[PDB]
Amino acid sequence: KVSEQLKCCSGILKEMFAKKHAAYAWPFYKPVDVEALGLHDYCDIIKHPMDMSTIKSKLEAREYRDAQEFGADVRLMFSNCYKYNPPDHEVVAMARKLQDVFEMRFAKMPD
Fold this sequence. Notes:
This protein is mainly α. It has a single domain (1-111), classed as Histone Acetyltransferase, Chain A (Up-down Bundle). 61% of the residues lie in helices and 0% in strands. The chain has six helices and no strands. The chain has helices at residues 2-16, 22-25, 42-45, 52-60, 67-84, 90-107. Helix 5 (67-84) runs antiparallel to helix 6 (90-107). It starts with a helix and ends with a helix. The record marks 85 as: Acetylated histone binding. Belongs to the BET family. It comes from Homo sapiens.
């Protein structure tokens, strides 16, 4: 039940990682590299970084009590992107495309 919803979450994150979505999902695969040129202020702006690899690790370590906790982290990931980046930045458009995939699957999780 919660077990079933957590399995659904794993499939969702699996699809997010799939070749199908790779053209827009790739910036979200790994933590933001705060040592990269231009990101020297990232941690000043973003208090709680999150990325898909970290989410994968947390699912695998059974650190989400339920699908709502999983969803919170996925949304945190997107919101950090919307907060930090200029609203016309290509990465914001990419985030939206990936979020469309997530929201549609997450909505259709049986309950």
